[PDB]
């Protein structure tokens, strides 16, 4: 299924080329431009941990997910990843706990050492 492509066939987008962050384009974005640190970003998104037992369409649609790139507002995994998209583009990431909560987790929702997986949608993006 879609993780698994991603672990296969996924662009590694870790400075230290860890594996920790895996990338597939799934729909091609406009232009060229993507955001830099300190833009807003506005997303549409759905994830799940990789074991599937949680599972957040809170952003699926509804009102737009937003956050400032690059400022740990989100997972380190999200601040690599959404910065790396064009507007209009969809990708998925699955990503290592190291990006993402660790050993601790964030208990009960996230367990210690979760891998994670991601759709997501860049709608927008503006300077600070
Ligand atoms: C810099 O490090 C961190 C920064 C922020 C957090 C909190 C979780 C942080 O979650 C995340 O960064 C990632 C990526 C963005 C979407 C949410 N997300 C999650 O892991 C999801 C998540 C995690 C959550 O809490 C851990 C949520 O809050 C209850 C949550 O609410 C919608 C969603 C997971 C849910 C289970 C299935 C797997 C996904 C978060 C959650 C909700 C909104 C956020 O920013 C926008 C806003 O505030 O409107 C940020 C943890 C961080 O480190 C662990």
């Not at 672990?7 to 232009?31: A, F, H, P």
């Amino acid at each position: 299924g879609a993780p698994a492509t991603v672990t296969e066939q996924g662009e590694d987008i870790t400075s230290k080329k860890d594996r920790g962050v895996l990338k597939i384009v799934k729909r091609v974005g406009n232009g060229e431009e993507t955001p830099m640190i300190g833009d807003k970003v506005y997303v549409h998104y759905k994830g799940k941990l990789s074991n599937s037992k949680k599972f957040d369409s809170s952003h699926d649609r509804n009102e737009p997910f937003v956050f400032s790139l690059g400022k740990g507002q989100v997972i380190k995994a999200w601040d690599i990843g959404v910065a790396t998209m064009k507007k209009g583009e969809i990708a998925h990431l699955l990503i290592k706990p190291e990006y993402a909560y660790g050993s601790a987790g964030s208990l009960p929702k996230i367990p210690s050492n979760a891998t994670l997986f991601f759709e997501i949608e860049l709608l927008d993006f503006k300077g600070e």
